[PDB]
Subunit: 168 residues, 6 copies
Amino acid sequence: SLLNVPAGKDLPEDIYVVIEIPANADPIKYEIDKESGALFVDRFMSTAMFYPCNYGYINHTLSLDGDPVDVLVPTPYPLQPGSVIRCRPVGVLKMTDGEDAKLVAVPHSKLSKEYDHIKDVNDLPELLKAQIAHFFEHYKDLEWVKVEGWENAEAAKAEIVASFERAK
Amino acid sequence: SLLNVPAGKDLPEDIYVVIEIPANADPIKYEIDKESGALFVDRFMSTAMFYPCNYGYINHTLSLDGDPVDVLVPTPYPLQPGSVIRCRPVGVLKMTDGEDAKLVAVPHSKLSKEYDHIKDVNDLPELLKAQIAHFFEHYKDLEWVKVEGWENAEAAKAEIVASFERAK
Amino acid sequence: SLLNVPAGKDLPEDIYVVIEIPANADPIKYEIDKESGALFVDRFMSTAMFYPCNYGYINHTLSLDGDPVDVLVPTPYPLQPGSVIRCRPVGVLKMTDGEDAKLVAVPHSKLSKEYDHIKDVNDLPELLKAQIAHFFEHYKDLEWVKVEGWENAEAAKAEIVASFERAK
Amino acid sequence: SLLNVPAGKDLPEDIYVVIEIPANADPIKYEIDKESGALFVDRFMSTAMFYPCNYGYINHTLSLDGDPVDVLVPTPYPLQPGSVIRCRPVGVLKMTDGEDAKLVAVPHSKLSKEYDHIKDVNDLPELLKAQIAHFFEHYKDLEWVKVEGWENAEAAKAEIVASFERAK
Amino acid sequence: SLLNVPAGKDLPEDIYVVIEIPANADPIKYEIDKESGALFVDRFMSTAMFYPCNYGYINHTLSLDGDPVDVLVPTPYPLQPGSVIRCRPVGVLKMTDGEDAKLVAVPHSKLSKEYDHIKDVNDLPELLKAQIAHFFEHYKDLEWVKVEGWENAEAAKAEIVASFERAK
Amino acid sequence: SLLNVPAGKDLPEDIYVVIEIPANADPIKYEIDKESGALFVDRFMSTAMFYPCNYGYINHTLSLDGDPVDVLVPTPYPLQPGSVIRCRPVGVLKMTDGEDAKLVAVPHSKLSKEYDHIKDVNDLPELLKAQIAHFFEHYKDLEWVKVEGWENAEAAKAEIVASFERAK
């Protein structure tokens, strides 16, 4: 099941992300249930907003909010909820609800050459970055959250390493 | 797997429904296979009709037609086949092929406040109810079924309780 | 999980195909991971082409390319990745990358009567056959493959039988 | 505008159909407004049914129900409301609300070779024909109509010729 | 063309709205060009938000922002850009960029009985109203606007009457 | 109607393109009819390929193939057939069926800042360029065409200027 997916081939450089919400989909927030590995409807979002990238998590990690590290993964076409994609981290958007750090990872080079030039957080389209920051600032307006800024691939991997160790 | 999803948090008030067919989808009838927990194509519907709500079942229950209790769940956007949604029962549409009772359950308040006012069968939109009755009367016209009417949340829960006990 | 789906009810006549890519979908190539049974993003296709039929494989078989036998299944509406469909084989498109034989199987009569007349490879629409041949010739142009022709239902089943034995 | 589209290149053999409702779409009934040529929302259908083929009319014709001759056109993919397709008639489904005759026309050979073998009403898939008959019998159940049967391409063209003359 | 659509059958009670952006669509802002009546891509929205209802305008009206009165129309399924829907006004959301008043109108009873009970601004779902207010407050965050509140059907019609007179 | 759309605001730098086929759509080839301005189904494509960008033409131009200059326009989301988008040219893919030159134009800066950095043909993603070249080489394989290469924005505008003059 999804409960058995590795954290990655070569942490923190090569990770696997379990997808819960596809890019641009209807406002249904799903989550993988730790008990059955099944896709559960977590909530219907109240705002008229959509996730700008595919949203998921790295299995076998645990951050301080007691949840697995969340990653946002841009792809050329929306992915299937419950699917797994191999990626490499490039940045982290730090915020506070606690501390939520949503990493941004791009598809691994073996899946597509389209993201090869993206190696660090400032290599990502500025508009993509404002749109992601804006979504997190505002998605729970009708349900608090504060963006504090972006950080590089080094910080992202530090976050992966720490959460993985913390999961052990 | 889906075979391990509970019948609910607090039967018969708080149940989980395993989704097989989303609201408004192409006429493909899927079912979860009791052996693998995998989604199987049960049949291609012959009529040009679509399910008016998401269609699924409560795991760990058994009705007299030797099948799990079937539930119809209205949501603001179509759900994913194989996903699970927490709901609360509000009615039952009784019919006969045997006795099929398709319950109607609405999303649990923790998932969305939109259905909070819906507490009993007459709180559901009349048009939604005619449309559901009409679908069951006519979906197998080219494949018999007879609608006998609606019943309240009390009857629905009685149906859940009985089928759950019968499953044990 | 999907890892536990049988090869079929009555090999080679009655098989089950595990679906990875739906007909007419975005160019994302998925595959079921032998380790978790989870849907993995195998690759993003580079060409502006879509699979003309649903694409999948027969579990518990092994061909010479060290992979499970791949099948293409036409249906009236696109299927869900990860779902299973009961079919009956009718042909094989032989090619070479090694030897890849992609079988063509149509939905089993119990799922729909629409494909009952299709019993052998020449009963399939000519346009459907050219379109499939054309897709395989050209889908990896930007990533080699050569079509050698079609073969009947007898050859297809021989291929199923052999790969199943080889899997044992 | 759409008000200026010819009835056809070579009536009754070669006609143009103005599309109002695509095959398999949401239950919104549109119609082209004789005054502006604009697409107007005529009604929201109450039943959970979808048109099995693209639905439209032949401009410059007038039947007895004081409306333009309506045609159903099967295509491999849904068409755009307001678009025009060149076709050739092959049958008519006679009914009564008055007399409604919905013709069935298939795409002209110059647009695609896929329908070339379809020359008369019995050349159409039986399932397609039952599904169309069933839709008309039941689409207004919640809004009367009675199917009386099918007729050949000769009757269809007679219907086109008469309505065109009647329009003059 | 769309330039010739009336403002309504019985202003301000019975109006026609020309649709530019469907409910829940990709973030493309279209507008009807006063010169050709053609649908022009006005802008690609920068925020990850979607219009919660169909968005359009009443032809033959002119407000103070030198633009036609804009209306938001909830329907059970998304409409086609460029289509026209008969409605009746029920409220207005007043704001300021100038003065923008976006009316809310529901489908006319002749198109569907589903909105008959909605007669005034407080009859609209509270969540629908917060979602609309929230969208306008935030849709141009990356491109200013301030919501001042809702008003009744009387104010809405006053707005229609005034803008129509102003258009003459 | 669409027949009245200008060639552009400031030819050859600022043009308007009339869209016939959206990016990534079903294989239906539409064209705007010079007589009514209506969208006509030109043909159903036989290959399992989709246009990689929105496809259209510049009104009021005439190339040597006796047809209006065709343009391919990448956008973040698919456009509506029949809509108009303001763009600026950046390249031309020269080929031969005669001489077909399909220009590539990107959305005008006033519609979105996302394409501002794209000023010449080599500023376009290499993969986007191979995919477009590949599509034209192969889309009519089952219906000839030969790609000869790309050219800069200067050549593109020369092509626009010449065809516009030729249209006068």
